[PDB]
Antibody
Framework: EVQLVQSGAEVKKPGESLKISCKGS????????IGWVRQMPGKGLEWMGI????????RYSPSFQGQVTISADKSISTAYLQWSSLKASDTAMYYC????????????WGQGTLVTVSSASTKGPSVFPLAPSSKGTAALGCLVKDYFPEPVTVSWNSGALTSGVHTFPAVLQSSGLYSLSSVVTVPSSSLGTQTYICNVNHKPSNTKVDKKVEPKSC | DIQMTQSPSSLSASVGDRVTITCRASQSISSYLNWYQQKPGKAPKLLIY???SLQSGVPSRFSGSGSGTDFTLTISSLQPEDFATYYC?????????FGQGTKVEVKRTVAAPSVFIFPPSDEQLKSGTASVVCLLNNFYPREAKVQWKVDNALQSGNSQESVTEQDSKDSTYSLSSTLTLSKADYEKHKVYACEVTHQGLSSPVTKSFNRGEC
């Protein structure tokens, strides 16, 4: 079958250069145009440009003309998207897609490459308790604060607790660091006996943390 | 050079409902109009090409109609898997352009949030920052308003919030909101309140604590 495979996620700093790739297989790569599509976080799809790998004939969308270079290496069935100087506003998911010339549809898509551009540096999270009451449905949780970059993983009781768990999307703080909460609703009668521990892992900084969450004393 | 306008930007509908999404072009694009489906965390997927032709593999509940400037995607009877974001796209003339997208989410009975508040930890306070967290759990619809109050002063600009994806089992949302203030600011004031407004509540629900309480 037709497949488009894109290179791995990128975390970069402003002013750095970058070239991401897209390899086609299961068809003649030099026979079809390949498009590049930008998707900013929580935003819509934007056409960036297109290339015919047979001869590297290229069209750019006016908004991306002079901003990026689209290229291809047909000897290895690969199309490229590149920046010489990244900006934080380049943060986005980038898709490559095959264009079929008859009706102009994009019929097969790559899995996407996530590019994160920030002046922030790698930093492990601090994990703070969201404590349940010490005096019915109760809520408790963990605040996973001041980390970079995404992602973190959160489990409860090493994966033994999944019911009532909500792990929220992270927010980006003005500091450029992320903050995330993970909560669980439980019976208030379980609070005295049942142990609740959040298991947090942040691979990029190699920071692994277990935080026991319990009612506080006054 | 050709602008695509989708309507609505967001849509709520029950399983088995007829769903219609409209796409309008700034000029006649003949029949060169495509529809894509995008699920959260996944790549867009072609549903319909040339305005009305179904891509192979796509169920017959999906159909498209229209020519010139006006186009509609129809899902005849919604299924759980159809909940996603949908984009139209013209390939009539370069530069090729997408519509802004339409999110289709599951309609269910209105459910009021269960509200919880969390004081900052002593560990965090030692670092010079206080995070106060308010949880709105298992509510519908998505639209909800959190108003932080510190000694009756309404807070603005010093909070951030996020919402979970719609729950696949119960069709609800949950929202987490963090009020962030300095340790010095936190210790100067006493009453911390999270006021929640939502269609499911006849009047706003407030959860509060006095700094020191546990």
């Amino acid at each position: 079958e037709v497949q488009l495979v894109q290179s791995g996620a990128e975390v970069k700093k402003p002013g750095e250069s970058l070239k991401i790739s897209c390899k086609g297989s299961g068809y003649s790569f030099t026979s079809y145009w390949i498009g590049w599509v930008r998707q900013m976080p929580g935003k819509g799809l934007e056409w960036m440009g297109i290339i015919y790998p047979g001869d590297s004939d290229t069209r750019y969308s006016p908004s991306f003309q002079g901003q990026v270079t689209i290229s291809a290496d047909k000897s290895i069935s690969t199309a490229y998207l590149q920046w010489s100087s990244l900006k934080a506003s380049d943060t986005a998911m980038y898709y490559c897609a095959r264009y079929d010339g008859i009706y102009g549809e994009l019929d097969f898509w790559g899995q996407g490459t996530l590019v994160t551009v920030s002046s922030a540096s790698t930093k492990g999270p601090s994990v703070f308790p969201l404590a349940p009451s010490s005096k019915g449905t109760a809520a408790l949780g963990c605040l996973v604060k001041d980390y970079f970059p995404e992602p973190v993983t959160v489990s409860w009781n090493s994966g033994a607790l999944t019911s009532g768990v909500h792990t929220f999307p992270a927010v980006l703080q003005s500091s450029g660091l992320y903050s995330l909460s993970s909560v669980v609703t439980v019976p208030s009668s379980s609070l005295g006996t049942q142990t609740y521990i959040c298991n947090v892992n942040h691979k990029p900084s190699n920071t692994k943390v277990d935080k026991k969450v319990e009612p506080k004393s006054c | 050079d050709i602008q695509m306008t989708q309507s609505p930007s967001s849509l709520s509908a029950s399983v088995g409902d007829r769903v219609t999404i409209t796409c309008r072009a700034s000029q006649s694009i003949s029949s060169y109009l495509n529809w894509y489906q995008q699920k959260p965390g996944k790549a867009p997927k072609l549903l319909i090409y040339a305005a009305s032709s179904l891509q192979s593999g796509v169920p017959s509940r999906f159909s498209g109609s229209g020519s010139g400037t006006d186009f509609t995607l129809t899902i005849s009877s919604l299924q759980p898997e159809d909940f996603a974001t949908y984009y139209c796209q013209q390939s009539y003339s370069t530069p090729l352009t997408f519509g802004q997208g339409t999110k289709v989410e599951v309609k269910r009975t209105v459910a009021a949030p269960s509200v919880f508040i969390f004081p900052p930890s002593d560990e965090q306070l030692k670092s010079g920052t206080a995070s106060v967290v308010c949880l709105l759990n298992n509510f519908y619809p998505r639209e909800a308003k959190v108003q932080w109050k510190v000694d009756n002063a309404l807070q603005s600009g010093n909070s951030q919030e996020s919402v979970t994806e719609q729950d696949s089992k119960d069709s609800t949302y949950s929202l987490s909101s963090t009020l962030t203030l300095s340790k010095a600011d936190y210790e100067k004031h006493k009453v911390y309140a999270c006021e929640v407004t939502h269609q499911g509540l006849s009047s706003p629900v407030t959860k509060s604590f006095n700094r020191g309480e546990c």
